[PDB]
Design a protein around this ligand. Structure first.
Ligand SMILES: Oc1ccc(C2=Nc3ccccc3-c3ccnc4[nH]cc2c34)c(Cl)c1
Length: 287
């Protein structure tokens, strides 16, 4: 079924990278229609369109409780400058949601979100998709009891014969969430996604205290005087020599263990998401 543009009423801006807006889909024209989230492109060159169209196919192929739901596409005369339509998740980003509620969400709740993040990523892996941008600002909160993986604008499908995807011309990169081989060779895989997931679990257990974020720690470790491409040079040598983010204040030592195990230089030694979700649920059972 179709989403017609004249019926999408703008409500509020949500994020720019394209750009995401909260709209009401109101075909009855009486303001009782569904509130939806809508993405469209900012500058519509053929390469960005091609990436957007891929993001749309990927999201459309995913149906999991912890993956944001695709609803449809709104099409357009002359240019066919699509809008992506999705479910609106009303508590917003997990980063912003944890900042607001800080330590008033206990370790048990944090582990419920962690579990659901692993479950979502694991499902993503059974399809041979590499997310590439797992961080708390890219996870969305549906309610107290449920989070979903979002932002698929950077996801790649592995080739049929290879276990990594190599980016030739990197654009915007969240280097502080990156695996060493992604920093050095621009190789991305299930294992690099697991490494990032380690950084997400750190984020969670620091409750997003700013002076504690990944960029902050890593910059203190490399020295705050490093600028541009020298940050990458230094971060790579630091990672090689086993500099890591510390264990956050109050973090249970068994959760810290998972982090450090995700942050292994040897890609083959990082655990799998299936095992992570098993482990994380066992820890929940215990508490
Ligand atoms: O491939 C994807 C996956 C998730 C979203 C998405 N992104 C956002 C980006 C910034 C700020 C808020 C959102 C947001 C807020 C509330 N509900 C929402 N549903 C869906 C999104 C969202 C998008 Cl645009 C594309």
């Amino acid at each position: 079924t179709q989403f017609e543009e004249r019926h999408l009423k703008f409500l509020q801006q949500l994020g720019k990278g394209g750009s995401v807006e909260m709209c009401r889909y109101d075909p009855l024209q009486d303001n009782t229609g569904e509130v939806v989230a809508v993405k469209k492109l900012q500058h519509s060159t053929e390469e960005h369109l091609r990436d957007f169209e891929r993001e749309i196919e990927i999201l459309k192929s995913l149906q999991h409780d912890n993956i944001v739901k695709y609803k449809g596409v709104c099409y357009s005369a002359g240019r066919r400058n699509l809008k992506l339509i999705m479910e609106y998740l009303p508590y917003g980003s997990l980063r912003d949601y944890l900042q607001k509620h800080k330590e008033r969400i206990d370790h048990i709740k944090l582990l419920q979100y962690t579990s659901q993040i692993c479950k979502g990523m694991e499902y993503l892996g059974t399809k041979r998709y590499i997310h590439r941008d797992l961080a708390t600002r890219n996870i969305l909160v549906e309610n107290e009891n449920r989070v979903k993986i979002g932002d698929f604008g950077l996801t790649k499908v592995l080739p049929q014969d290879k276990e990594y995807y190599k980016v030739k011309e990197p654009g915007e990169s969240p280097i502080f969430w990156y695996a060493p081989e992604s920093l050095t060779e621009s190789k991305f895989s299930v294992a690099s996604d697991v490494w990032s997931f380690g950084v997400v679990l750190y984020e969670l257990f620091t409750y997003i205290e700013k002076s504690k974020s990944p960029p902050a720690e890593f910059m203190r470790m490399i020295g705050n005087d490093k600028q541009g491409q020298m940050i990458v040079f230094h971060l790579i040598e630091l990672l090689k020599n086993n500099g890591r983010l510390p264990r956050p204040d109050g973090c249970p030592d068994e959760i810290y263990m998972i982090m450090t195990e995700c942050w292994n230089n040897n890609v083959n030694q990082r655990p799998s998401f299936r095992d992570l979700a098993l482990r994380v649920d066992q820890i929940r059972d215990n508490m």
